[PDB]
């Protein structure tokens, strides 16, 4: 089964998931000089005041903080989107060292980690139907650099001890994801895919230009998680990122000059 190791990592995925070599795969390098400013892009609308987190889960690839998506409580709209996308979960990808970890890169620069807030298009009714559509998902990506702590991340960091291994979950209510956003909502946007199997080409990517700062102590705690299940040989959950894939026939647009 797929993973991030030498024998099952990203360069192997195409054997079970041939769309791995497809025309709109993610992540990509964002060449800031080639990205075109598009003055017709609208500001992003992030409406998370009524978000309802429920649970946090180690799924063997990362940890997801899951949200109640049975009603329009935490939605992303505007920007390049038509319609309303509901938050279902967020998770991160990170490195074994601060020098790598992000999925997207910016002029080939790798950040220490990258946060993905995953939303699905409500016109498709549920997440499972949405992934089958080219405009099914909107993922808001936010880079993390190591420096000052992010106060709004600490509640997430502090519960990781309780979900160390694959398949463990913990109650995780009343978490406010507004505490993970940078000051500016300037963004790059392009059409792409999920970045793990099934690698479906159903995502409008919206990657914020401004990274958030997290402390070394915070990201160190990410790296104590495990890929493996309980009572199995310990493999640290580190370097759970897919590298940049060919841009091919796409253009990345910028919301800002
Ligand atoms: Zn992700």
Author numbering: 4 to 125, 127 to 261
Paper text:
The reaction follows a ping-pong mechanism, in which the rate-limiting step is the transfer of a proton from the zinc-bound solvent (OH−/H2O) in/out of the active site via His64, which is widely believed to be the proton-shuttling residue. The decreased catalytic activity (∼20-fold lower with respect to the wild type) of a variant of CA II in which His64 is replaced with Ala (H64A CA II) can be enhanced by exogenous proton donors/acceptors, usually derivatives of imidazoles and pyridines, to almost the wild-type level. X-ray crystal structures of H64A CA II in complex with four imidazole derivatives (imidazole, 1-­methylimidazole, 2-­methylimidazole and 4-methylimidazole) have been determined and reveal multiple binding sites. Two of these imidazole binding sites have been identified that mimic the positions of the ‘in’ and ‘out’ rotamers of His64 in wild-type CA II, while another directly inhibits catalysis by displacing the zinc-bound solvent.
Site 3 overlaps with the CO2-binding site, displacing the ZnOH−.
